[PDB]
Amino acid sequence: ASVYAWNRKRISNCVADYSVLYNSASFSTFKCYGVSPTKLNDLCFTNVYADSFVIRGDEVRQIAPGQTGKIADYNYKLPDDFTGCVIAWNSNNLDSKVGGNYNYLYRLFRKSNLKPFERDISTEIYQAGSTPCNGVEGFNCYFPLQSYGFQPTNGVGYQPYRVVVLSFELLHAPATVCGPKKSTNLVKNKCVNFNFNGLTGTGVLTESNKKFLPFQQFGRDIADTTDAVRDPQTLEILDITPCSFGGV
């Protein structure tokens, strides 16, 4: 999308994969705020917002929290408390066309500075003089939007940068968006410290004949202690028994 018509998509009710974005590293700009880009995005979120818009290279810093500029105050304003990722990359082959591509617009002037995460699709002729615009293109009345005009042979500062702003809310208790997960291979018939869904315990894991209900993760027998647990990766139910101990 163009910057003025900033398109928003909602990443909801799915396990998120940020490692694939990290290992690819195909994004020249990788600035994450609140959550660090150094493998800290493997976390749980109630709401993940993805927003895409194509800007010129030279003002891709402007769209950072507490920064000011034309794009910042008239097209897309980032909240000063942004706890997300501003990811940017060159799209010169894809988004520059011979003779220029004029499909991407930007609001050079507007009556007032834009509020956080607020859109303006209005085409009302900007006022710059005492004479009313009346919806005509003339002196002291100018169309608010302009074409970037990316050209194939141009500086990267004058070449398009696709930006996919990711807005995280950092709530780990509610957490619709499941985070990326590590993988640890199953080990059986050994006294092992197991951490199943945050539950830490000591004991051996063995094959379990118990049939858990689909909505049940771990089981508790009489006297309220864990007896059988279903691992979430491969939905396998394993019986937990304490490893051997006794007096001497």
């Epitope: 499909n103 085409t123 009346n134 005509v136 003339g138 002196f139 302009q146």
Partner: antibody, heavy 122, light 106 residues
Framework: VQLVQSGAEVKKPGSSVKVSCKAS????????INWVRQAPGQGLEWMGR????????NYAQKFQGTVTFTADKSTSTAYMELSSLRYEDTAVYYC????????????????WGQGTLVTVSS | EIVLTQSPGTLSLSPGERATLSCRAS???????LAWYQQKPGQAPSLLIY???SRATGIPDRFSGSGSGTDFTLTISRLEPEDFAVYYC?????????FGQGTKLE
């Protein structure tokens, strides 16, 4: 670069007509289209403009309510609809370019179509 | 809305050398938002001079405008036998792009 328009309309008085100025490739992208009424033997009367990309059409006070401007984003063709043929409405309707963007700040008419003359008959 | 009054109404008497084709407006043209045109007989007008003195693509350098404020000149080095087309003024200063009456009408 080329804005070939419609020819001549055999429209009996009171009968509506639609014009067909044809924009070349990339015309609509960065340029608005303007229509000017040229009644045979007078001066040029600016009717209004069509901003094709955003579908914005604004008309002068004189022609408001009497003429309709439409443009087709696909096929890149400019259209003008006349509500009915009033007796004084007979004129050669032209179509012309404009650098409507602020940075260009043109707003003048670069290139023009051949013209579409409406009349009581031929 | 700003009106325009072309003063030399009829200069199609096959003249020569420099001309003084004029236009004047009730309220002064702002920022040289004027456009000269070239309406050849039987054909559509072609842009002649935009701004105040700027040159158009294809147009000879001979055509020029020495105007300011109430922009009023279309100096031409030499009246060509073919170049007797009625020249039209226009103002785009936040108005409904009104045109003048014409200056070389037979």
């Amino acid at each position: 670069v080329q804005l070939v328009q419609s020819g001549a309309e055999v429209k009996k008085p009171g009968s509506s007509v639609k014009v067909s100025c044809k924009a070349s490739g990339g015309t609509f992208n960065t340029y608005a289209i303007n229509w000017v009424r040229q009644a045979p033997g007078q001066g040029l009367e600016w009717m209004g403009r069509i901003i094709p990309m955003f579908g914005i059409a604004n008309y002068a006070q004189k022609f408001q309510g009497t003429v309709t401007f439409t443009a087709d984003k696909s096929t890149s063709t400019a259209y003008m609809e006349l509500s009915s043929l009033r007796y004084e409405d007979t004129a050669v309707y032209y179509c012309a370019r404009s650098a409507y963007y602020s940075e260009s700040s043109g707003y003048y008419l670069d290139y023009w179509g051949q013209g579409t003359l409406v009349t009581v008959s031929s | 809305e700003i009106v325009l009054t072309q003063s030399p109404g009829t200069l199609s008497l096959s003249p020569g050398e420099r001309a003084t084709l004029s236009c004047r407006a009730s309220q002064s043209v702002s920022g040289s938002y004027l456009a000269w045109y070239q309406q050849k007989p039987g054909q559509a007008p072609s842009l002649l001079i935009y701004g105040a003195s700027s040159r158009a693509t294809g147009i000879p350098d001979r055509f020029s405008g020495s105007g300011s404020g109430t922009d009023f000149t279309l100096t031409i080095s030499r009246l060509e036998p073919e170049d007797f087309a009625v020249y039209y003024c226009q103002q785009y200063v936040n108005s409904p792009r009104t045109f003048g009456q014409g200056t070389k009408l037979e």
